[PDB]
């Protein structure tokens, strides 16, 4: 009856312990430099194949911020405020979260599904007998592609969001280019409004990809488990991004 929940919680938490151990091995020892020349290939499916989604969302978010900012800011200071609010919002809160979640979706479920199949088909297992450690051959380049790709995407998301904001806020709705640009320069500091967006992005890139690899590399070889793993990678990295985003922003701007 009740003990059921008890057992569920106990096992899920044991699994986090396992994930921590896996992460340690993959990051801790990677001497096979000759085979890491392929991670550039792996990046194709994490980074290159995801620009379309990040770019389109960045444009819609920029345009939305432009319109909502404007309808509020006409009562307070659009001439000075569209610039400052569009750029701070995108650099501090949205590029690191919206790109992080779209990424967790598009790259995250695809990646976990792929590791999942590698395990389910027994293909991965056959490598143990050939002496090729699957963590160094299969997992390593996938985790690294995730680390590099999300941060570069995060920057693009914001770059597009700025275009979106200006396109409506300045060009269709009647605001000065001068004060838009100077306002942004007056209030946006590289140190640390641009820099903190990047730091949060690295944290999310590691946490989110780490989960996707871990769940794909599941214990139970049952077909039902692939769909379960895919749903869970989206849910867990999604909450983790929001949880960590809160703490990091609390420090960075508090």
């Amino acid at each position: 009856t009740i003990a059921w929940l008890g057992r569920l919680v106990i096992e899920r938490i044991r699994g986090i312990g396992v994930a921590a151990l896996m992460l340690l091995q993959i990051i801790f020892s990677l001497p096979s430099a000759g085979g890491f020349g392929r991670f550039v290939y792996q990046m194709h499916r994490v980074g290159v194949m995801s620009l379309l989604i990040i770019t389109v969302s960045g444009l819609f978010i920029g345009l939305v911020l432009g319109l909502q900012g404007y309808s509020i800011l006409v009562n307070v200071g659009s001439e000075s405020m569209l610039g400052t609010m569009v750029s701070l919002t995108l650099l501090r809160e949205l590029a690191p979260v919206v790109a992080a979640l779209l990424f967790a979706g598009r790259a995250g479920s695809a990646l976990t599904a792929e590791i999942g199949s590698m395990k389910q088909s027994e293909q991965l297992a056959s490598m143990e007998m050939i002496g090729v450690d699957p963590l160094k051959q299969i997992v390593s380049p996938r985790l690294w592609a995730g680390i590099v790709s999300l941060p570069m995407l995060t920057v693009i998301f914001a770059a597009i969001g700025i275009v979106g904001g200006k396109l409506v806020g300045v060009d269709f709705l009647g605001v000065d280019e001068g004060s838009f640009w100077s306002g942004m320069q007056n209030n946006v500091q590289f140190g640390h409004d641009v820099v903190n967006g990047i730091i949060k992005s690295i944290v999310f890139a590691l946490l989110c990809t780490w989960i996707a690899v871990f769940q794909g590399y599941a214990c139970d070889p049952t077909p039902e488990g692939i769909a379960t793993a895919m749903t869970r990678t989206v849910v867990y990295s999604s909450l983790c991004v929001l949880g960590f985003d809160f703490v990091l922003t609390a420090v960075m701007f508090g």
């Binding site: 319109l67 409506v168 269709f172 009647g174």
Partner: protein, 56 residues
């Protein structure tokens, strides 16, 4: 299953054309509308310091 194929494209084209229209039309509520009968007038001035296009 060859026969079903055609109908499917025709449905796409219509639903899609409608969606494109919806966007182009609906955004006119805020941008691209004069909201007037359109008469114009001119006037000249000695000093227009601080006017904007779109002032009332």
């Amino acid at each position: 299953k060859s026969r079903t194929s055609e109908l499917a494209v025709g449905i796409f084209v219509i639903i899609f054309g409608i969606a494109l229209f919806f966007l182009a039309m609906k955004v006119s509520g805020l941008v691209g509308t004069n909201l007037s009968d359109g008469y114009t007038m001119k006037a000249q001035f000695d000093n227009v310091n601080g006017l904007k296009p779109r002032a009332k």
